[PDB]
Amino acid sequence: QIPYIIASEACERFSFYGMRNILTPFLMTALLLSIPEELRGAVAKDVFHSFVIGVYFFPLLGGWIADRFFGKYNTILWLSLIYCVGHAFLAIFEHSVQGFYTGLFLIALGSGGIKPLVSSFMGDQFDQSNKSLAQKAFDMFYFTINFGSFFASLSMPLLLKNFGAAVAFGIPGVLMFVATVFFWLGRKRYIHMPVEGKGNIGLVLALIGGVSAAYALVNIPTLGIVAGLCCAMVLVMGFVGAGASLQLERARKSHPDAAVDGVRSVLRILVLFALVTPFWSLFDQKASTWILQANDMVKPQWFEPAMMQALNPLLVMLLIPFNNFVTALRKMGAGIAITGLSWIVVGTIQLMMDGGSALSIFWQILPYALLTFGEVLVSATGLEFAYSQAPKAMKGTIMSFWTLSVTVGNLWVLLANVSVKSPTVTEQIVQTGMSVTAFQMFFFAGFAILAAIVFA
Known part of the structure; x- marks a missing residue:
């Protein structure tokens, strides 16, 4: 018995994607102090992107507890009873200033610190028949990520319009008590492996x-x-x-060579990964600014702004046989080039909402599908580049930095609504050529191209 992993993993994805989804519209629906739609967005990103920071920041304080301090099963149990506690804080403290962030704070550590745990854990639950079962693991975890977004569009956004907004954030938290149930029931199969010169x-x-x-x-x-x-x-x-x-x-004084020489080389390759950071500022932001354009767009009473968001990763599940017909370094070099055009393609269509304004549903599908191809060229290649760096045993730098680039890309999103918001003299110059909204739809579009140059 090993499937207890995916049974519980299935329930994390609606608890995380049915959370990530609802985050931006709830800021627009439940906030007073926030003044116009200009100052309701630079507050939606200010507190929401600061939550995506925490989700990809905590993986550090995840393993630090999971290897040095506590075990593995104790971490996953203790953190889930902090993950669900985070959700419980949301539905209960629905209309609260402190109460809501204090909630998002517990999701940030409850989810954040847990993902680098669950991932390593699966392959560990089998050592005897450690062969064909390894293929099943990565696939069953990746069939959870695709099924995760499915629930976040066909049954999750409707919980705010056709149902009360409180139970909407209440439902993922109910799914979390299910994840814990899968582990109390998973208590059988568990393994732990911790001079002037x-x-x-x-x-x-x-x-x-x-x-x-x-x-x-x-x-x-x-x-x-x-x-x-x-x-x-x-x-x-x-x-x-x-x-x-x-x-x-x-200052290398009596420290291994050929082993550290094949590892100190990886640290300078880590900087080539820090150049793939503006992609995470356009994929973890698809859950923020991309939903903002949909609001002004004439959408029907069923095809709500939150659906379009949680319907586009379902295109990756069908993208698999197309990549077979269509050179590692060249594969990732196209990932940064894709988001440069895929962002500016809507950076023009946004100013048309201030003029024409039409279609909405189909006129959001096409520019979103553009990122979906570059989405495959970063996730499937960013991990497999651990082979070409050659550290082998030195793993606590591969995951801990490639995934902590997600946490740096989101500081660039947080930069945009501070330097291009707070100063008066800076505001006078940015509004000359274009608009306040479209300047971000230009700045971010251009930055993905600035990275493809440094790549070489």
Whole structure:
């Protein structure tokens, strides 16, 4: 017996995608302090993208507890009773300032820290017949991700219009008590596996540790509750990522070679992955700004703005045999080039809503399907590039950084509604050539092309 994994995994996806979906419309429907639709969006992204940060930020504090401190089954149980607690906080504290974020805070750690746990765990539940069952695992987990979005459109958005908005956030939380039930029932099958020469060259490296320590203080006056915390992290790990790629290379005193030489090479390849970050700013944002364009668009009383969002990843399930007919480095080089055009394609159609404004349903399907091809070129290749880097045992850098690039891409989304919102002089210049809304539909479109150049 091993299927208890997917039985529970099935219930996480509606609890996460039926959450991620509802996030933006609920900000627009349940907020007072938020003034116009211009100041209802730069508040929807401010508190929602700060939640997607936390979901991809927590995987660090997930394993840190799961390997150094607690076990695996104890982590997944303890975190789920924090995941469902997060949901329970939502439906109960529906109309609350503190109550709602304090809720989203527990989803951020409850979900975030759990995904790097469940993923490793499956392959562990089989060592005897550790062969053909390995193929089943990745496929049954990926048939959950596709089925996850299905529930988020045909039965989840309708829970706010045709049903009360409270029980709408209440339903995923009921599905979580089901996930815990699958583990209390899964309690059987469980496994755990936890000199003037030296004084002149050496002072050059140590000082860059004070250079990186200076960036974190600049975040205190920013008044960034979230942005300031994530910026302090990115700036430190950024000026140690490429900065300390020579700092420890110079002061290497009796540490392995050929093994660390085939691993220290991976750390500079990690920077080539940090260039695939503006894709996550256009795929975790499809759940925010993409739903904003649909609101002004003339949509019917059944095809609500939330459906279109949770209907497009269902195109990947049919995209599989098409990739067989249509060179690893070249495959991922096209992923960044796709989002450059796929974003600007609607960056023109958005200004037509201020003029013509028509179709809506079919005039949102085509520009969304454009990302769906580049969606396959990043997810299926971003993981398999661990083979070409050659670290093998050194795994606690592959997942912990490729997935923590999702958490950096969302700081660039958070940047857009701060630098192109708060200053008066900056606002006077941006509104000259184009509009406030379409400038983001230009800035983000252009940034995906800026990355394809650095890629080389």
